[PDB]
Design a protein around this nucleic acid. Structure first.
Ligand SMILES: [Mg+2]
Ligand SMILES: [Mg+2]
Ligand SMILES: [Mg+2]
Ligand SMILES: [Mg+2]
Ligand SMILES: [Mg+2]
Ligand SMILES: [Mg+2]
Ligand SMILES: [Mg+2]
Ligand SMILES: [Mg+2]
Ligand SMILES: [Mg+2]
Ligand SMILES: [Mg+2]
Ligand SMILES: [Mg+2]
Ligand SMILES: [Mg+2]
Ligand SMILES: [Mg+2]
Ligand SMILES: [Mg+2]
Ligand SMILES: [Mg+2]
Lengths: 121, 104, 196, 120, 203, 169
RNA sequence: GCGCACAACUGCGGGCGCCUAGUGGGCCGCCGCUGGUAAGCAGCGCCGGCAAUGAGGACACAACCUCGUGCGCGGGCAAGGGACCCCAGCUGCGCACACAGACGAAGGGCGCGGGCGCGCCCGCCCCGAAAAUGGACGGUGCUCAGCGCAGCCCCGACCCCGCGCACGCACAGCGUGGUAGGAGGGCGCGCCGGCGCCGCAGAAGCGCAUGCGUGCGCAUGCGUGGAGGCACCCGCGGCGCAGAUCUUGGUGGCAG
């Protein structure tokens, strides 16, 4: 189904939760680089969790790819379907969340006319 | 089809490891009757299968004997999926045909 | 693979037998050790008794109910040896220790079984005959193990029954050999290979 | 070693494209049809039959046995040239004394004592 | 190469045909392998390993058999293994692991304008040699010859070779590698037995 | 280890066109220790340091073991302990000269903890049986000497075997 | 002014200016010292380290040894090891018997093994050798798991090599640790000037999922909700919290 099959190639299945976000509910899981003087994650001691680096970054051309080779496109109305008509195979289209059900009907019908794959429907 | 009909059983004894750090992609196997390093050269490149059950459904995890290990016929094998440390002490079956590092 | 070993413990150095036992146990073997009163400790007996008295001295002062337990049986003392040759606090080492069963003498459950030896752990192979040595039952009968004589008597009655059955069995191996060498058997055998 | 049959002494005919090999343990003898498997799964034994016939057969419809699947293939087919070259190795097996029992018997692993004992 | 080596053997056996002792002219270069790592190096010894272009262990270079270079090799002899390569070790080091230090030239018709601080480590192709030495040398063996026979082109030929990023040796160093080979280590003058390390280090 | 005869001299200059040639017979691990043991003797007997030495020749003295009998060797050595430097005379029976010094090195290490580098050999002489001074090596010079083996040795590599199996014989 | 001319080796781009931070308690090792009976004491010199340097090996262990360090894969190794814990060992030659190896002195030992001239010398062992919770060659244990040696082999780091990717660079390539600290580019928040839009056919918010993302975070699905909101470009800023015996509010355990 994609034009070119891009493998997933995320360099780790790690999530990089924040340090001690397991132990404290005040510490949310969004990553903060720990800056303490004795902190075992900053010091990169063995047994500590890993910190995000440049090295974990996925490939430039594989980045932000969905369903193999596709790239997501936000759609708010039927006018957004028109620049996707020529490039059907490159983009999976996604209707925005705040689009109402009346306009989602008209997006859904024009997308199957223009042959655009909708991830919402 | 019994695995012991055509394949030689080998016990999964350890992962390839340091004293503490363990590299689980390479599994150390002790083939029965193989007791020296030159005896285990007969099994370099040979395919190996680890047979297990997931929810009662039989699975084959296939691998390749990659390198020798030590002077006592222990060989290191790399499988499709890494062997769990639960299966240490259980048997895996060493095939009599060579497979390649790309194609198990 | 038959991964079940029954070890006869006589003439074996204790820690040298224990390493080959524990290395088998961590590979999934089930080892049973018989005749554990005859497992040998090298060196003179008085040095070995001082090592035991050093063991008996170690106990929890606060509460000896939870202290280092002191074993007077040769089976539990040999089990204590192999216990720390495995990682017994981890689940991999404790599961391996469940595959040991160590006994004094030969219980009648192990009548007519096929017993093994570790030749690299034998005293006649490892030790010099000039050096002294003593068994577990020689030591522990002076530290509260009262069952040395009843072990050896019941050991003998097992060995006499097994020597009797071996006297019968090898005669059957004798007669089957004399039958299979007979020309009546051979021409019976080549007649079947003729038809195949 | 790894096929539908997977412990069956067969005889090797011809190496086919995409790494395959034509084999037939003769279907009168061992109830094994013509097949192609991967080249590697054939463990080579030292004894060779004296087959003089050409093995360039119409391979287009021969049942190919994959590795893990034991998928129940359809039974025997028309066998235009397969009947001739089967009878030639029934001719070859009849010359050698115990070779008929050999190809009929499923393979057992030799009792391991050394790798010298694994010569075949 | 064969004629030069045959002439020395004929010179040597003719000398022992008489009573004499003949040792040839010792080679025009040393081959030097960095044994110790980059840590805990005093500033003089760290500087000499920079001027020998030995910036990591298991790196190998050729240095000239000079009187100043011999004194440089002596002061860092606790960090290096050096000796004499013959023509087989010279050619194996360059043909199997030989890269060129090439400056970029942005204009085709003008080889005089180029970049100073950025030198690329590229393959030792004939055209890289023909561009550096302005038509005077244009093959790899002709670069070996300036190394082997120590010509006037030695300094240009040796510097054109990137330092040999060798592997660590097969079968190990066989002991405690930091001490001298006269004490059982692997660190010092391996006078002509330097191939016993380096041949194990190439692959 | 090996035996080396290493020839060397002062490097010839215009002042001294043919310097005196010296040679040393070294039992060394390789030629680099053999050059090292040669350079110290030129530094300490004469005053020629190693920068001004040319090593003219290094040859491997190897004996022909054509029919391979056992000879007797008397070794005069000088070994340095932790406490001092001493003279010793040891007698060995061996195959070659280079094997007898290997018996010297393993014996001085076993009996005196003298390492190989702590030992300098004054002379190694192959001896008659009549000239041997050690009565322990004299006992094996007698013809028709015989003894049994009392040490048990295994006949394979075993981890566990049944009781009936012969392992020693 | 004319003429001559590129000067040992090796490496390699270099010079200078401006603004500004942090720092100004250090500590450790090596070698060399000073004071002191000494000190894990105090004070110096040189170099290296820790601080700020992970990882491997040291039983654990800021500094020792190896050795640097993006994310992986493959190889080869280092230090250190190869009875079992615990990855990896076999072949030979010695030596030692003391709950030794496993803290030690002067002084000793017809203890054993070598050597020299009864006395010396060298190895191992012994005596000298006594502490308070029970207990530490790390443990098990080991008397060829001790003390020595040789041969061949093996294991073992993020080291080295090779490959791939990420990021940085002046980009046929090279590089990649980091406290205090500086810099760059983004993510996020309230509102502004615009510009594209969305919403009672259900906005924000919320809950649970899925996806994207190195990461800050983003998007969607379902549920809830019931009226607003989003994206981008700009501009303004009371703009991002785990800490402050923080503030306020709520709630636990304690505790029926
Ligand atoms: Mg202090
Ligand atoms: Mg470091
Ligand atoms: Mg560390
Ligand atoms: Mg550590
Ligand atoms: Mg290796
Ligand atoms: Mg092991
Ligand atoms: Mg690196
Ligand atoms: Mg960085
Ligand atoms: Mg910072
Ligand atoms: Mg907003
Ligand atoms: Mg936003
Ligand atoms: Mg504020
Ligand atoms: Mg808070
Ligand atoms: Mg904070
Ligand atoms: Mg309360």
């Amino acid at each position: 189904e994609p034009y070119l099959r891009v493998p997933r190639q995320r360099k780790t299945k790690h999530k990089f939760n924040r340090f001690h976000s397991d132990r404290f509910k005040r510490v949310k899981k969004s990553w903060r680089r720990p800056k303490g003087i004795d902190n075992r994650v900053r010091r990169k001691l063995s047994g500590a969790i890993k910190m995000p680096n440049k090295g974990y970054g996925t490939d430039k051309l594989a980045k932000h790819m969905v369903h193999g080779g596709f790239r997501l496109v936000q759609i708010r109305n039927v006018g957004d379907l028109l620049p996707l008509i020529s490039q059907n195979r490159f983009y999976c289209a996604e209707v925005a969340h705040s689009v109402g059900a009346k306009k989602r009907i008209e997006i859904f019908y024009k997308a199957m006319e223009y042959g655009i794959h909708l991830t919402n429907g | 089809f019994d695995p012991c009909l055509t394949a030689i059983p080998a016990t999964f004894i350890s992962h390839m490891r340091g004293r503490r750090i363990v590299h689980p992609s390479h599994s150390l196997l002790r083939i029965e009757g193989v007791k020296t390093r030159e005896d285990a050269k007969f099994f370099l490149g040979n395919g190996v299968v680890s047979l297990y059950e997931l929810s009662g459904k039989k699975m084959e995890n296939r691998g390749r004997i990659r390198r020798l290990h030590g002077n006592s016929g222990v060989v290191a094998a790399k499988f499709e999926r890494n062997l769990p440390p639960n299966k240490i002490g259980t048997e895996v079956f060493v095939k009599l045909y060579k497979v390649e590092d790309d194609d198990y | 693979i038959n991964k079940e070993i029954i070890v006869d413990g006589t003439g074996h150095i204790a820690g040298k037998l224990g390493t080959y036992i524990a290395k088998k146990l961590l590979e999934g073997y089930t080892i049973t050790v018989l005749c554990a009163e005859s497992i040998v400790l090298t060196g003179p007996i008085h040095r070995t008794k001082l090592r035991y008295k050093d063991y008996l001295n170690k106990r929890c002062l606060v509460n000896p109910l939870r202290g280092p337990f002191h074993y007077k049986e040769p089976s539990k003392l040999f089990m204590r040896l192999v216990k720390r040759m495995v990682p017994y606090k981890k689940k991999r080492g404790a599961a391996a220790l469940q595959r040991l069963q160590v006994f004094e003498g030969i219980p009648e459950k192990f009548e007519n079984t096929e017993r093994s030896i570790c030749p690299r752990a034998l005293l006649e192979y490892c030790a010099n005959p000039i050096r002294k040595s003593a068994t577990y039952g020689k030591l522990l009968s002076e530290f509260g193990w009262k069952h040395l004589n009843i072990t050896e008597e019941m050991k003998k009655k097992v060995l006499q029954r097994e020597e009797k059955a071996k006297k019968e069995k090898d005669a059957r191996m004798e007669e089957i050999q004399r039958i299979r060498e007979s020309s009546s058997f051979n021409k019976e055998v080549e007649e079947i290979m003729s038809r195949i | 070693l790894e096929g539908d049959f997977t412990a069956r002494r067969v005889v090797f005919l011809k190496q086919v494209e995409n790494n395959k090999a034509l084999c037939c343990g003769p279907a009168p003898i061992n109830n094994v049809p013509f097949f192609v498997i991967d080249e590697r799964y054939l463990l080579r034994t030292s004894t060779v039959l004296d087959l003089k016939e050409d093995v360039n057969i119409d391979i287009s419809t021969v049942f190919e046995s994959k590795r893990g699947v034991v998928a129940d293939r359809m039974d025997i087919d028309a066998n235009s040239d397969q009947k001739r070259i089967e009878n030639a190795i029934v001719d070859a097996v009849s010359s050698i004394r115990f070779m008929k029992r050999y190809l009929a018997t499923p393979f057992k692993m030799p009792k391991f004592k050394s790798v010298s004992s694994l010569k075949f | 190469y064969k004629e030069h080596m045959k002439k020395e053997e004929d010179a040597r056996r003719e000398a022992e045909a008489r009573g004499a002792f003949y040792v040839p002219k010792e080679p025009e270069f040393y081959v030097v392998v960095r044994i110790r790592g980059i840590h805990k190096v005093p500033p003089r010894e760290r500087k000499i390993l920079e001027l020998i272009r030995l910036k990591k262990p298991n790196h190998a270079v050729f240095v000239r058999n000079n009187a100043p270079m011999r004194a440089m090799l002596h002061k860092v002899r606790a960090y290096i293994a050096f000796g004499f390569a013959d023509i087989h070790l010279l050619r194996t080091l360059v043909y199997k692991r030989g890269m060129a230090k090439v400056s970029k030239r942005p204009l085709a018709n003008n080889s005089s304008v180029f970049k100073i601080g950025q030198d690329m480590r590229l393959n030792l192709t004939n055209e890289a040699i023909e561009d550096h030495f302005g038509g005077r040398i244009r093959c790899v063996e002709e670069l070996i010859y300036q190394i082997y026979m120590g010509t006037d082109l030695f300094k240009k030929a040796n510097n054109f070779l990137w330092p040999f990023t060798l592997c660590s040796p097969r079968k190990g160093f066989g002991g405690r590698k930091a001490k001298d080979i006269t004490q059982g280590g692997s660190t010092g003058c391996h006078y002509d037995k330097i191939g016993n390390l380096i041949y194990r280090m190439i692959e | 280890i090996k035996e080396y005869r290493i020839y060397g001299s002062k490097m010839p200059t215009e002042q001294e066109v043919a310097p005196q040639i010296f040679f040393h017979n070294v039992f060394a691990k390789n030629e680099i220790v053999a050059r090292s043991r040669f350079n110290n003797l030129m530094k300490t007997k004469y005053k020629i340091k190693s920068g001004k030495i040319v090593i003219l020749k290094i040859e491997e003295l190897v004996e022909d073991l054509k029919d391979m009998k056992i000879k007797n060797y008397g070794i005069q050595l000088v070994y340095r302990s932790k406490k001092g430097i001493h003279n010793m005379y040891k007698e060995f029976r061996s195959i070659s000269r280079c094997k007898a010094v290997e018996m010297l090195f393993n014996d001085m290490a076993g009996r005196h903890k003298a390492k190989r580098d702590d030992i300098k050999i004054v002379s190694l002489k192959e001896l008659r049986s009549e000239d041997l001074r050690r009565d322990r090596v004299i006992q094996f010079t007698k013809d028709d000497v015989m003894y049994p083996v009392f040490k048990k040795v295994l006949n394979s590599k075993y981890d566990f075997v049944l009781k009936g199996t012969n392992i020693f014989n």
